[PDB]
Design a binder for these strands. Structure first.
Ligand SMILES: [Mg+2]
Ligand SMILES: [Zn+2]
Ligand SMILES: [Zn+2]
Lengths: 65, 1095, 58, 245, 46, 58, 405
RNA sequence: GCUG
């Protein structure tokens, strides 16, 4: 639902990188290059940002507010 | 034509997927209801001839629920699920009844409420943008096609039946080839059979007590003269000779004229109704009524003229005789002969019966009150009752029992509850087909995969178990047809040269050149040139003059050409190849994407055509452009569409053994994942949600079309395929503790507790009373700790086992009847909703949330049909590590792949590893996908071995492992089954009152059944004492008093029979046996017992 | 042995010798049990529980 | 919207910049805790509509204030003399940008968190290194001198900087310059001719150790602490042997 | 001990006493949700 | 479901449990690892007999 | 619960452990026919001293290590236990003192703690001191010097060259003297179920139930520790066809396809010779089926020859841990004609199996012959034919279980 | 209906 705070296998903090990754993608940056700029060198960390589906925004549309 | 793929999304925007359910109800609510009302229009009373009750126009309105006497406000699908109401709309009809003596016309009289399927034309959700859906609290990505009845979403499963109006030549148990055409019309549906039980032809029908020799039927119809009958059936020596024994049978009897045959058939008609039928219907007249509306009803007599019924009867007789010779019986497994019936047809049949029952009940009321109660006028509108129609449909949807006695239809299992385990589970249930033969245990019958199913039913998607082939699933690009008018097809055929059948003596039907034209089962004539009718009819359909779904097919062996516009027939779109060149032409394909053309334009430009299974028999489809030959007629639009929704989700399905693909389809439905964007608002009985869902690294084209990525159900996990620990032998998996700690596999299970407080007619109402404080503590008692002041628990508070969620008192005055939580583990109340049901009754619904981390014994599947339980959870330090520092989340045994032959999983690890490093999502679509050669090159650029085998070192020993270990990311889905919910133990607990044996359900404290097979193994072991202890002492041991003289059981040392206590003696018996001896004695079987002292 | 499925002959030497020891070959069906066993509840626990209990009360 | 159990798990994963050596292990139970054994952090965030906002308000950030809960919001509540011992800003969440939760107007999260000393064996939340790994040093040796276009393919087979091709006499010749960079993809084996001309080996006793910290404490300190922990384990057993004899 | 419930659509707090129909002022909604507990709840982060 | 097969030949039995089965290579072939929860529910009746008296009291 | 033979109920001693799940040793899973893919099993506690004794004496696993049907052992090594042992007992496995001591150390638990381990003198002694795997496996049979078991076996292993009883090229003749393996590698035949040439069977028959059970427990400790540290894995490279197979399959496929064409013309234009029992359209089908079988067999032989002596799939087939050479051939070379009821796929459409082939085509590939391998992938028509054959097996098992019960 |  929300970006996981730590990578499941390695344990690197990946919670901070979600906002930057979305912004880099908004610019011309490629998905591989965007992950490279964030510094996610190992494949385990890269999949967390690449494979994450952000449902918190969609779910909140139905939240009480 | 690289973009020939683009046509699958475009056909899918309008038709396909779950639409086949929606467009069907739409036809019933917009066209079929009016056809049924015209057929049962007009109710006439025996007591007054003048009284008449016709129906003029029936409309079905928007769904609305009124919670007050006259509010009539609109309603939403979510509110009905929450308050356990039924989403339905009013059925309003227009009538012109007699009244006192006038012709009063009423416009808009409600006759009841109709259940409405979601996303249907009448549904509120249709035409709503995603923002509008949020106010209605409905997920935009919801399949639809289901009915909310009493707060439960119910789906009517598609049913496969043999086609109606078409003769079926089939062997009887005796090997005696017979024939059977089911005539389905808008008035009467009946079965007419033909049989050769003694070498002579008899016709059978349910209105006739005895089988009638066919020649008598022919003479009654009006073809008097043996030569005309013989000329019609056959003029070949064999056909005439075999119909020779049948000619004598009438000759032996004296029937030689219509009257003498009609009377003979009348003396046999069952005359069941002798009461309330008045006086009428002589025996000859009853026969002329049967031969004209009951036998072969689809063929219609113009003015009591059977010229048409007699030819059709001859065609049936000839087909039995040619078949009897070579034993070439028609296959009832061919999908050409089978038509699938979806909701519209099932609802129309149910409505047809309820409308005739409502009309009958109104006539019975009118006949009783019009001639007796008073001169005061009888107004039907006052006595008309809304309940008969509303209650009837709802009950059939709520409980899946199609018991319609009028049509002799007694089928149960028609509707099932929509499965909300996952998004895929719901989409699969919509595309689900139920077989006709369900008790068949022969392997080579319906259970087999038939080549006719190609492109229509998914080959690999089937439940494994009691229904291996009984339940089937529709493929992606399939359209089930709906009934069409047929006025144009009849006209084009006559002008196309088809000579009438009334203008010819039957001899023609046996010439080799003459061929017969059948439309939806009724003969339209005889044409000498088959090819021109077939190639002209196709050319006309391509120009759009005739409907796209009408199908022309020709059988040379039996000289007939069949035109079908019936409906219920599976049709698949195909590109047309003319002169070795496909018609798409590339430029048109770009135009679709740009916007100039839609799929319909391609259909009427002759670019694309729809072919049913019968039409496919006459075509030579080529799967790929390279395979095009001179004979090839069509080209397949996309090969991967052959698989279905569940089958598509598997990466590289073509590279695996087929049983493995079947298992994945079942497992995908059982996976725990996001259900909808409205998942939090819903309060369903059980919901399982993955805490951190992730999109699959190797996707398929089907995943994109289904929008699985928008709401995914699994997590990508780094997996090392190696043998580690020995705790992963027979399908077990080893998981790192740190990944489980970091959040891998974390799931939330939500359960619903529902309490309703009711108001009785006595005016006494249940009440919720506040927590009972213990005064000394000035605090509530432990059992009532969570309750708020009102008496219902408060959201956000932990509930332990035996605590009371709602304090409810029921008047016997009030005796407390509390709703108490009974969970082996604590749960937290998330939402408590208070509402009123259809009859206001204070329904209270609570959602309880429990979060479970993966634990030893949880089930995880790989999306390749390999399912394993978690054998061991190891610390990160003990797990083997590659140079990069990646340690595996899951270790999978290499032994699984060789027997299973799942090469596809091995390809998926390589593609995923390459994709994550590249930043690209690779495709593993069936019959295509990323090749191994291209993926390997990407790994080499990124510094990894092309084969994906990596050099690893051992965490336990610190020294390198001798073999290179394959390491890569693969999607793993956590399955719903969890050890916490499957663990049951019973010592001494509740025993059922009837037999004193333990209970049968974990919820009821259960008790395990040592059955006969377990008992047999114990007899083989030779253990006499163990059987006695297990089956008597630890189940139902009991003492009975038996008398020595009689042999009959007594009570407290006495026998009320031989009133002498002296002989009574005690015995030890299983208590069940005491029940058997008592039930035997009550039924007059006396189980007298002789008692001997142990020595 | 045609289906793989090795088996001792001493099992088949017992099954055959039970099946043909009362005069004629008594196949193990519902019907062959009546001609093999005398006791009722052993027949009554097998198929045809209605008729086998009434007939042994007659 | 985030469930309290999920929100509790996310907060446990977030790293704290407090130095572990100063604090002491909490005894079993003893939930209340003490100034020495615990640190208390309070997060209170309420989401409200921005009073001055543009009409379209398509972006949530313009439309709402405090829409996203970040680790910056967490505020340390000093206990006892902790405030004097630790100067302001010494005790803080290390990252400062981790997204704990997302809120919509009218939604509030109020909570208090207690932080305790722990080892990675009990839970991964207590682990101090993103990854600690060792690789033996690569020692590629060319058995036979390789010259010509073969040098270009040999350079391509290995990692980018390991093999440098030098024209000694105007003819390309291959030498190994930086073997440490080699990733051991073993693509040389794919080329049949070069497979026999090179040997791929790792020196057994030379280990290159890479430690990446989570930011809780400096990486050099972490490695020194690890060596001391092993020294402690040996001492504990030696003390037991003294007691036995 | 006042009991205050929040409606599904209006989101306006409504006070309903015992034996009072569950309708919410400011709207016609018949679905009302009880408010969250004031009591402190302890969760182990593990 | 009838009395003869359902309640006589096969009977529901007390002192039993059903759980998912998982691997354990460290157990001898004659041993099964039982969950502590099922162990607490399932009980065996032991009579005091002069050799179990001290063990039973503890 | 699906009890089918005597061995589905077995007694077990009970040792309480914290995890919730009924965990047993995996050697005893083929009597239960129990895989761990989500299965649940039932536990019953006898409540009488007379019932407890009957269960231990009669239904105990140690007393029931052999099936009553043939007398062959049913409790025996499976899967990774079998592969660790085959890999340990290969001629190349050589070990230094430290590695030997660690592997032997796993045995010392659960009553082996009170036994002093005997380390056999190293097989190699002067250029370097080294033991052999066959020497380390032999400690499972006689762990200590005071163990009295002196097991003897002399049997052909699978892969036996047919000549040189104990000097075979493949090292596949097993000789065990005084509980010491002198030759051969352990495979399903010597360590697995179904054979009376098993070591565990000789230990049961000659030295007793306890000695056999102690040895089986020691293997379940030693075999996993070697394999986890050695590393065994499968990958795509293991199933990838090499150049020799690739060139050969093309030649074999063309030759068989043309020979089939010749017979099809012989049935039509000329005259086809008929077997005395057989008739036309049956002689052609049976003779074509044999030729199609030859293509798969010859393609398989080429695939096995090219495979290296290190393929994980081959090693599992060479021992009997998992798989067969037909499974490896289908994955790497060519899957064969899919057969429904022993015959080529029947015609669902009139005179045609599918609308993608010409009517009255008796050509191979229009009747279910799939030339492609699982690794290459199945074309859409080939995939449908394979699914049809696969469903027949799935339907058969479900129907068969009801009939046998 | 599904798991076994
Ligand atoms: Mg299983
Ligand atoms: Zn008496
Ligand atoms: Zn409101």
């Amino acid at each position: 639902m929300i970006i996981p705070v730590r990578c499941f296998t390695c344990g690197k903090i990946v919670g901070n990188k979600w906002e930057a990754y979305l912004g880099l993608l908004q610019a011309e940056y490629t998905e591989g290059d965007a992950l490279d700029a964030l510094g996610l060198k190992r494949y385990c960390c890269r999949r967390m940002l690449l494979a994450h589906v952000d449902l918190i925004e969609k779910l909140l549309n139905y939240a009480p507010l | 034509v690289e973009e020939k793929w683009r046509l699958l999304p475009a056909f899918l925007k309008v038709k396909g997927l779950v639409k086949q359910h929606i467009d069907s109800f739409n036809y019933f609510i917009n066209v079929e209801i009016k056809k049924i009302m015209k057929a049962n229009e007009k109710v006439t009373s025996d007591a007054d001839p003048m009284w008449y009750l016709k129906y003029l126009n029936i409309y079905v309105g928007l769904p609305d629920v009124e919670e007050s006497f006259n509010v009539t406000r609109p309603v939403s699908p979510h509110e009905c699920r929450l308050r356990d109401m039924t989403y339905s709309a009013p059925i309003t009809v227009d009538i012109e009844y007699t009244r006192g003596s006038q012709r009063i016309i009423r416009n808009a009289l409600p006759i009841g409420r109709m259940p409405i399927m979601l996303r249907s034309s009448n549904c509120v959700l249709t035409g709503k943008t995603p923002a509008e859906f949020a106010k209605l609290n409905e997920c935009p990505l919801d399949p639809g096609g289901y009915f909310i009845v009493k707060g439960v979403e119910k789906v009517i499963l598609i049913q496969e039946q043999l086609s109606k109006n078409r003769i079926i030549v089939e062997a009887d148990r005796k090997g005696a080839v017979g024939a059977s055409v089911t005539s389905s019309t808008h008035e009467k549906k009946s079965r007419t059979n033909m049989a050769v039980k003694q070498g002579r032809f008899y016709l059978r029908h349910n209105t006739l007590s005895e089988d009638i020799p066919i020649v008598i039927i022919f003479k009654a119809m009006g073809v008097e003269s043996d030569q005309e009958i013989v000329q019609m059936i056959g003029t070949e020596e064999h056909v005439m000779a075999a119909f020779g024994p049948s000619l004598e049978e009438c000759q032996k009897a004296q029937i030689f004229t219509q009257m003498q045959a009609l009377k003979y058939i009348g003396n046999k008609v069952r005359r069941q109704r002798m009461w309330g039928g008045g006086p009428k219907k002589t025996k000859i007249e009853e026969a002329r009524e049967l031969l004209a509306s009951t036998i072969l009803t689809h063929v219609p007599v113009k003015e009591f003229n059977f010229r048409a019924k007699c030819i059709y009867t001859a065609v049936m007789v000839r087909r039995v005789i040619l078949a009897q010779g070579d034993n070439k019986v028609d296959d009832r497994d061919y999908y050409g002969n089978k038509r699938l019936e979806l909701a519209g047809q099932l609802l129309s049949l149910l409505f047809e019966d309820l409308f005739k029952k409502f009309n009958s009940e109104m006539k019975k009321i009118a006949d009783q009150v019009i001639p007796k109660q008073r001169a005061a006028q009888f107004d039907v509108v006052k006595h008309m009752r809304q309940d008969q129609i509303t209650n009837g449909m709802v009950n059939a949807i709520s409980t899946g029992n199609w018991s319609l006695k009028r049509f002799k239809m007694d089928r149960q299992g028609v509707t099932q509850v929509l499965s909300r385990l996952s998004y895929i589970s719901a989409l699969g249930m919509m595309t689900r087909i139920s077989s006709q033969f369900e008790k068949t245990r022969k392997v080579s019958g319906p259970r087999s995969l038939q080549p006719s199913q190609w492109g229509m039913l998914c080959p690999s998607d089937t439940p494994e178990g009691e229904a291996c082939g009984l339940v089937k699933n529709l493929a992606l690009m399939t359209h089930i047809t709906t009934d069409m008018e047929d006025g144009p097809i009849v006209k084009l055929a006559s002008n196309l040269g088809v000579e009438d059948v009334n203008l010819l003596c039957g001899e023609e039907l046996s010439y080799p050149n003459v061929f017969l034209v059948f439309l939806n089962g009724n003969i339209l004539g005889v044409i000498r040139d088959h090819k021109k009718l077939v190639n002209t009819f196709r050319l006309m359909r391509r120009a759009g003059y005739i409907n796209e779904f009408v199908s022309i097919s020709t059988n040379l062996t039996d000289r007939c050409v069949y035109i079908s516009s019936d409906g219920g027939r599976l049709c698949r779109p195909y590109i047309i190849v003319k002169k070795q060149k496909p018609a798409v032409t590339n430029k048109h394909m770009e135009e679709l994407a740009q916007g100039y053309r839609n799929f319909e334009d391609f259909l009427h430009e002759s670019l694309v055509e729809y072919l049913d299974v019968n039409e496919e028999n006459d075509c030579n489809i080529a799967l790929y452009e390279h395979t095009i030959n001179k004979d090839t007629t069509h080209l397949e639009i996309e090969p991967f569409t052959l698989l279905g929704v569940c089958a598509g989700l598997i990466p590289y399905p073509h590279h695996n053994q087929s049983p493995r693909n079947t298992y994945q389809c079942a497992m995908g439905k059982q996976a725990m994942g996001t259900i909808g964007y409205n998942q939090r608002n819903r309060i369903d009985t059980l919901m399982y949600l993955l805490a951190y869902p992730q999109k699959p690294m190797v996707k398929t084209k089907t995943i994109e079309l289904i929008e699985f990525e928008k709401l995914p159900a699994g997590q990508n996990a780094t997996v090392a395929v190696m043998s580690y620990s020995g705790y992963d032998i027979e399908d077990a998996l080893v998981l790192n503790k740190a990944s489980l700690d970091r959040g891998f596999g974390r799931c939330l299970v939500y359960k619903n507790a529902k309490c309703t407080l009711k108001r009785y007619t006595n005016q006494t109402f249940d009440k919720v009373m506040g927590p009972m404080l213990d005064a000394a503590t000035r605090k509530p008692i432990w059992r009532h700790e969570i309750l708020d002041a009102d008496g219902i628990c408060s959201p956000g508070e932990k509930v332990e086992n035996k605590q009371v969620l709602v304090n409810k008192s029921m008047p016997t005055q009030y005796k407390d009847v509390p709703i108490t939580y009974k969970g082996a583990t604590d749960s937290y109340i998330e939402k408590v909703m208070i509402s009123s049901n259809a009859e206001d009754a204070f329904l209270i619904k609570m959602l309880l949330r429990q979060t479970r981390r993966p634990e030893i014994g949880d089930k995880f599947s790989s999306r390749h049909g390999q399912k394993g339980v978690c054998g061991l959870i190891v610390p990160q330090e003990d797990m083997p590590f590659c140079d990069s520092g990646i340690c595996p989340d899951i270790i999978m045994n290499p032994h699984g792949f060789p027997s299973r032959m799942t090469v596809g999983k091995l390809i998926e690890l390589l593609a995923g590893k390459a994709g994550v490093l590249d930043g690209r999502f690779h495709y593993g679509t069936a019959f295509g996908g990323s090749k191994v050669k291209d993926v390997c090159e990407d790994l080499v650029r990124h510094g990894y071995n092309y084969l994906g085998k990596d050099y690893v070192t051992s965490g336990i020993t610190g020294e390198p492992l001798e073999a290179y270990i394959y390491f890569g990311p693969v999607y793993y889905q956590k399955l719903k089954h969890m050890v916490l919910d499957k663990m049951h133990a019973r010592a001494r607990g509740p025993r059922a009152v009837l037999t004193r044996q333990p209970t049968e359900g974990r919820s009821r404290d259960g008790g395990l059944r040592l059955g006969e097979m377990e008992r047999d193994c114990l007899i083989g072991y030779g253990a006499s004492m163990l059987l006695l202890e297990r089956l008597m002492i630890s189940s139902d041991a009991f003492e009975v008093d038996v008398c020595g003289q009689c042999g009959l059981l007594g009570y407290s040392g006495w026998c009320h029979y031989c009133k002498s206590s002296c002989h009574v003696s005690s015995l030890r018996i299983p208590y069940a046996c005491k029940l058997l001896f008592q039930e035997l004695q009550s039924m007059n079987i006396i189980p007298r017992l002789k008692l001997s002292k142990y020595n | 042995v045609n289906h793989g499925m090795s088996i001792d002959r001493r099992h088949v030497m017992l099954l055959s010798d039970l099946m043909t020891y009362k005069g004629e070959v008594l196949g193990i069906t519902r019907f062959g049990l009546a001609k093999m066993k005398e006791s009722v509840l052993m027949l009554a626990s097998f198929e045809k529980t209605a008729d086998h209990l009434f007939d042994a009360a007659y | 919207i985030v469930q309290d159990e999920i929100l509790a798990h996310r907060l446990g994963l977030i790293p704290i910049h407090a130095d572990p050596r100063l604090f002491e292990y909490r005894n079993q139970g003893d939930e209340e805790g003490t100034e020495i054994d615990t640190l208390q952090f309070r997060l209170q965030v309420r989401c409200t509509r921005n009073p001055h906002a543009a009409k379209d308000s398509s972006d949530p950030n313009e439309l709402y204030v405090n829409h996203k809960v970040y680790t910056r919001h967490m505020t340390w509540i000093p206990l006892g003399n902790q405030a004097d011992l630790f100067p302001e800003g010494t005790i803080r969440p290390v990252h400062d940008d981790i997204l704990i939760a997302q809120l919509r107007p009218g939604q509030e999260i109020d909570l208090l968190m207690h932080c305790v000393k722990g080892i990675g064996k009990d839970h991964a939340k207590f682990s101090p290194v993103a990854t600690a790994s060792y690789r033996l040093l690569p020692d590629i040796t060319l058995l036979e001198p390789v010259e010509g276009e073969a040098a270009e393919e040999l350079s391509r087979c290995f990692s980018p900087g390991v093999i440098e091709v030098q024209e000694v006499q105007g003819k390309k010749v291959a030498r190994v310059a930086n073997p440490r960079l080699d990733t051991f993809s073993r693509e040389i084996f794919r080329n049949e001719k070069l497979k026999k001309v090179v040997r791929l080996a790792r020196v057994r006793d030379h280990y290159i150790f890479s430690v990446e910290s989570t930011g809780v404490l400096p990486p050099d300190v972490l490695v020194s602490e690890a060596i001391k922990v092993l020294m402690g384990k040996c001492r504990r057993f030696l003390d037991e042997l003294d007691a036995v004899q | 001990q006042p009991m205050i419930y929040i409606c599904g659509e209006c989101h306006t707090e409504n006070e309903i006493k015992s034996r009072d129909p569950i309708r919410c002022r400011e709207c016609g909604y018949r679905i009302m949700y009880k408010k969250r507990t004031k009591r402190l709840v302890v969760f182990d982060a593990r | 479901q009838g009395r003869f097969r359902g309640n006589l030949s096969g009977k529901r039995v007390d002192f039993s449990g059903r759980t998912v089965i998982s691997p354990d290579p460290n157990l001898r072939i004659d041993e099964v690892a039982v969950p502590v929860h099922v162990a607490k529910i399932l009980t065996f009746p032991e009579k005091v007999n002069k050799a179990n008296i001290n063990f039973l009291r503890k | 619960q699906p009890s089918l033979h005597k061995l589905s109920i077995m007694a077990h001693l009970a040792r309480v452990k914290p995890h919730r799940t009924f965990r047993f040793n995996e050697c005893v899973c083929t009597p239960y026919n129990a895989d761990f893919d989500g299965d649940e099993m039932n536990l019953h506690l006898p409540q009488t001293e007379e019932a407890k004794a009957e269960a231990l004496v009669l239904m105990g696993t140690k007393a029931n290590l052999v099936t009553p049907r043939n007398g062959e052992p049913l409790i025996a090594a499976i899967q990774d236990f079998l592969t660790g042992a085959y890999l340990l007992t290969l001629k190349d496995t050589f070990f230094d003192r430290a590695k030997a001591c660690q592997i032997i150390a796993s045995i010392l638990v659960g009553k082996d703690e009170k036994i002093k381990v005997r380390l056999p003198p190293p097989t190699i002694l002067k250029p370097v001191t080294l033991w052999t795997g066959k020497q380390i496996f032999s400690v499972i049979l006689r762990p200590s010097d005071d163990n009295p078991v002196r097991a003897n076996l002399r049997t052909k292993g699978k892969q036996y060259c047919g000549k040189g009883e104990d000097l075979c090229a493949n090292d596949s003749y097993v000789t065990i003297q005084n509980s010491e393996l002198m030759s051969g590698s352990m495979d399903k035949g010597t360590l697995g179920s179904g054979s009376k040439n098993n070591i565990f069977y000789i230990l049961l028959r000659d030295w007793g139930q306890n000695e056999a059970a102690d040895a089986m427990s020691r293997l379940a400790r030693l075999a996993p520790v070697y394999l986890s540290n050695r590393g065994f894995s499968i990958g795509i490279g293991d199933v990838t066809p090499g150049q020799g197979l690739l060139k050969a399959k093309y030649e074999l496929l063309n030759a068989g396809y043309k020979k089939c064409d010749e017979y099809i013309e012989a049935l039509n234009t000329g005259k086809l010779q008929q077997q005395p029992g057989c008739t036309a359209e049956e002689t052609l089908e049976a003779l074509i089926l044999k030729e199609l079988s030859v293509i798969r067999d010859h393609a398989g032989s080429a695939c096995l020859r090219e495979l290296d002596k290190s393929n994980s799939p081959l090693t599992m087939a060479l021992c009997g841990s998992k798989g067969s050479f037909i499974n490896i051939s289908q994955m790497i070379a060519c899957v064969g004609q899919q057969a429904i009821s022993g015959s080529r796929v029947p015609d669902g459409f009139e005179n045609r199996s599918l609308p993608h082939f010409e009517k009255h085509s008796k050509l191979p590939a229009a009747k279910g012959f799939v030339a492609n391998s699982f690794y290459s992938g199945l074309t859409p028509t080939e995939f449908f034919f394979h699914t049809m054959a696969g469903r027949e097996g799935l339907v058969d098992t479900a129907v068969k279980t009801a009939e046998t019960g």
